Amino acid sequence: DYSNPGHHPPRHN
Amino acid sequence: CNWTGVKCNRRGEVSEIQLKEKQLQGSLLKSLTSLTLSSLQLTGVIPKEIGDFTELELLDLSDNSLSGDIPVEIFRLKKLKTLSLNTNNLEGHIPMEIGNLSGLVELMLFDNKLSGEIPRSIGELKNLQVLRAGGNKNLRGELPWEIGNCENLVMLGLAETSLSGKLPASIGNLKRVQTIAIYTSLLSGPIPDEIGYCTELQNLYLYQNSISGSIPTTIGGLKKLQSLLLWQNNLVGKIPTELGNCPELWLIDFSENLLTGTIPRSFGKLENLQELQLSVNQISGTIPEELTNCTKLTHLEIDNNLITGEIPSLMSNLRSLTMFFAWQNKLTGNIPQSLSQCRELQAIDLSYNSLSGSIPKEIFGLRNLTKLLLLSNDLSGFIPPDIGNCTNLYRLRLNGNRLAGSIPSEIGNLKNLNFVDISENRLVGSIPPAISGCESLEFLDLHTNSLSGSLLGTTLPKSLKFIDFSDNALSSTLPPGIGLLTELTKLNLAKNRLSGEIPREISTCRSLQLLNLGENDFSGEIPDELGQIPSLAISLNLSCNRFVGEIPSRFSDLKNLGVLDVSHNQLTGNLNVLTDLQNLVSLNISYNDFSGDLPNTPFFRRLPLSDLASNRGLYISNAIST
Ligand SMILES: *[C@@H]1O[C@H](CO)[C@@H](O[C@@H]2O[C@H](CO)[C@@H](O)[C@H](O)[C@H]2NC(C)=O)[C@H](O)[C@H]1NC(C)=O
Numbered sequence: 292d293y294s295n296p297g298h299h300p301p302r303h304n
Numbered sequence: 305c306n307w308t309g310v311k312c313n314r315r316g317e318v319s320e321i322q323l324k325e326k327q328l329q330g331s332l333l334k335s336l337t338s339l340t341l342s343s344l345q346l347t348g349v350i351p352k353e354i355g356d357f358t359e360l361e362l363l364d365l366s367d368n369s370l371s372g373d374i375p376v377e378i379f380r381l382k383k384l385k386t387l388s389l390n391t392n393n394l395e396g397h398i399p400m401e402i403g404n405l406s407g408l409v410e411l412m413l414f415d416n417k418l419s420g421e422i423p424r425s426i427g428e429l430k431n432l433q434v435l436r437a438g439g440n441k442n443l444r445g446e447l448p449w450e451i452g453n454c455e456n457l458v459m460l461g462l463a464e465t466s467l468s469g470k471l472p473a474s475i476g477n478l479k480r481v482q483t484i485a486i487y488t489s490l491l492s493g494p495i496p497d498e499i500g501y502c503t504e505l506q507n508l509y510l511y512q513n514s515i516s517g518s519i520p521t522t523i524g525g526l527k528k529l530q531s532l533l534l535w536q537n538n539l540v541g542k543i544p545t546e547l548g549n550c551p552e553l554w555l556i557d558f559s560e561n562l563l564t565g566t567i568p569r570s571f572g573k574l575e576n577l578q579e580l581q582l583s584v585n586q587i588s589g590t591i592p593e594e595l596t597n598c599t600k601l602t603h604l605e606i607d608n609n610l611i612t613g614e615i616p617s618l619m620s621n622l623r624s625l626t627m628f629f630a631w632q633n634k635l636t637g638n639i640p641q642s643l644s645q646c647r648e649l650q651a652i653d654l655s656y657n658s659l660s661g662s663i664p665k666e667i668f669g670l671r672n673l674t675k676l677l678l679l680s681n682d683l684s685g686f687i688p689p690d691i692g693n694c695t696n697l698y699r700l701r702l703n704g705n706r707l708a709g710s711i712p713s714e715i716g717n718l719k720n721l722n723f724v725d726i727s728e729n730r731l732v733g734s735i736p737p738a739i740s741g742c743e744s745l746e747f748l749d750l751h752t753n754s755l756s757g758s759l760l761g762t763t764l765p766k767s768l769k770f771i772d773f774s775d776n777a778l779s780s781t782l783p784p785g786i787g788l789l790t791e792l793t794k795l796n797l798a799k800n801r802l803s804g805e806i807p808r809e810i811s812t813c814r815s816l817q818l819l820n821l822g823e824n825d826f827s828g829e830i831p832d833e834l835g836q837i838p839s840l841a842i843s844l845n846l847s848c849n850r851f852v853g854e855i856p857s858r859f860s861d862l863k864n865l866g867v868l869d870v871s872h873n874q875l876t877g878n879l880n881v882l883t884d885l886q887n888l889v890s891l892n893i894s895y896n897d898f899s900g901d902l903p904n905t906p907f908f909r910r911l912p913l914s915d916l917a918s919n920r921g922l923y924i925s926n927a928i929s930t
């Protein structure tokens with residue numbers, strides 16, 4: 292649908 | 305008259321038609337004021353004759369398969385306040401004649417095949433409230449200057465389009481706009497300072513563009529501002545202090561920019577901030593203490609920056625924090641025990657810093673912590689026995705530190721622990737039997753420590769898929785009970801003092817793709833059973849041991865092995881058993897007692913002559929013509 296708004300996906304180790 | 309879907313004017317004239325969810329197909333009286341044919345699976349062009357219903361105030365064709373252009377004639381309908389064309393296959397330009405719909409309020413073009421530019425004519429629509437054209441991949445060009453003329457604009461979104469250039473200063477004229485969403489587009493240049501004039505702005509989503517320059521200071525004058533998503537752009541300069549003046553702001557995401565300067569002290573005034581993401585920037589300074597005043601913060605991600613100093617103790621004041629990511633910074637000092645007062649913490653990642661001292665035991669009292677990632681620091685001391693208290697611990701990485709002493713037995717208490725990496729520390733003593741109690745343990749990496757003693761099949765939990773004990777002082781014999789681990793994929797025991805024969809029980813680990821026994825004291829003959837594990841695919845490393853005898857004939861069944869290293873042993877006989885392994889990329893046979901001839905195949909010819917020179921009798925032969 293085109294994506295809904297979202298934040299930066301968080302990355303961890 | 306009264307039939308379902310049909311509505312009538314008081315004079316008895318057909319007024320509205322509404323049809324939905326009837327799973328039709330194919331293509332598709334003038335008093336009509338409202339027409340909804342929606343979610344009908346309709347195909348074909350929009351009939352050009354639509355423009356003929358002079359009384360139409362509403363047209364909803366959305367959620368169909370309609371193709372072709374948006375007929376210019378659609379714009380003959382002067383009384384239209386709602387045009388809903390979204391979720392179709394519609395192509396072409398948005399016609400200039402759009403400016404002809406005087407009282408248009410709602411315009412939904414989103415999720416189509418549309419192209420070309422937003423016409424300069426939108427400026428003529430003075431009642432327009434919502435314009436959503438997003439999800440048109442080829443909608444292109446700059447947002448026209450004339451957009452500043454739609455004074456009733458509330459919601460604007462162009463997201464996932466090819467919209468480009470700078471946002472016009474005109475945007476500052478939209479005094480009623482609540483949401484500007486243009487994200488994952490082609491936008492470049494600076495956010496215009498005039499955006500500070502949009503006094504009703506709540507949500508600004510500019511993320512995933514090329515936006516450059518700095519974040520305008522004027523954004524701190526938007527008092528109704530709730531969410532600011534500007535992540536993954538080219539943004540430069542310092543984070544504006546004035547942001548601390550937006551009382552309603554709950555979400556700030558600046559992640560993945562070029563920002564420099566300091567995290568502003570003024571952020572302490574934001575009483576509503578739930579989520580602060582600064583990840584992947586050039587931010588320096590220390591985490592300011594006033595940030596611990598933000599009482600509602602759930603998510604703090606400051607990872608991948610230049611932040612220095614100590615993690616403040618007053619962090620205990622953030623009682624709702626579930627997620628704290630400061631990894632890959634310059635943080636020094638102890639991890640504060642007060643961090644354990646945030647009882648909701650799900651994930652802590654402090655990896656890749658200068659943190660020193662002991663791991664404070666209190667952190668292990670957190671009952672909801674799934675992820676503890678402390679890897680690559682200067683941490684030392686013991687792993688606290690309190691590690692057993694941490695009930696939901698799933699992923700634990702302590703690797704790359706100075707940790708000393710024994711792996712505490714109470715780790716056996718953790719029934720959800722999946723993944724544990726303690727590699728590269730100073731750990732001593734034995735791998736504790738109690739670890740057999742971690743029922744969920746899959747990945748276990750103890751490599752590069754001082755661990756010693758023997759190794760028991762009883763000691764390891766049978767769900768393990770990955771074991772790396774390499775580079776330790778481990779000794780005695782590889783236990784027969786190794787065969788109890790049938791899930792085990794990779795097993796790396798290398799650089800230990802391990803001894804004896806390889807137990808035939810090894811054969812019953814049927815998932816094993818990688819076996820490294822290298823640099824040990826193993827002796828005797830390589831068992832035939834070792835060739836009975838057809839899952840061996842990635843590597844078999846037997847090198848730097850005392851193995852003797854010949855390469856077992858069963859080795860021909862190693863049809864999936866890509867890498868084989870037997871080098872630096874006492875092995876004798878010839879290589880014929882290996883000649884048919886078509887998938888073997890890498891063969892190290894050097895420093896053995898091998899002898900005999902190898903065929904002139906390009907494979908063997910790729911073997912270094914120095915490798916044949918370190919053997920007894922090895923040479924490449926040429927076959928006879930016959
Ligand atoms: C982990 O659990 C242990 C055992 O229940 C806790 O140790 C006890 O703590 C209380 C005070 O809170 C003392 O009265 C007991 O004498 C302690 N017992 C033992 C056997 O040590 C420990 O505090 C918990 N750790 C964390 C980090 O919360």
Ligand SMILES: *[C@@H]1O[C@H](CO)[C@@H](O)[C@H](O)[C@H]1NC(C)=O
Pocket residue numbers: 798799822823845846847848867869
């Ligand atoms: C096999 O083991 C030795 C000793 O640990 C190691 O140095 C060598 O690189 C390994 N061979 C391969 C192919 O990885």
Ligand SMILES: *[C@@H]1O[C@H](CO)[C@@H](O)[C@H](O)[C@H]1NC(C)=O
Pocket residue numbers: 847848869871872890891892
């Ligand atoms: C054997 O050869 C492979 C490939 O050249 C190499 O990676 C490995 O280090 C070698 N083994 C030893 C013991 O040096």
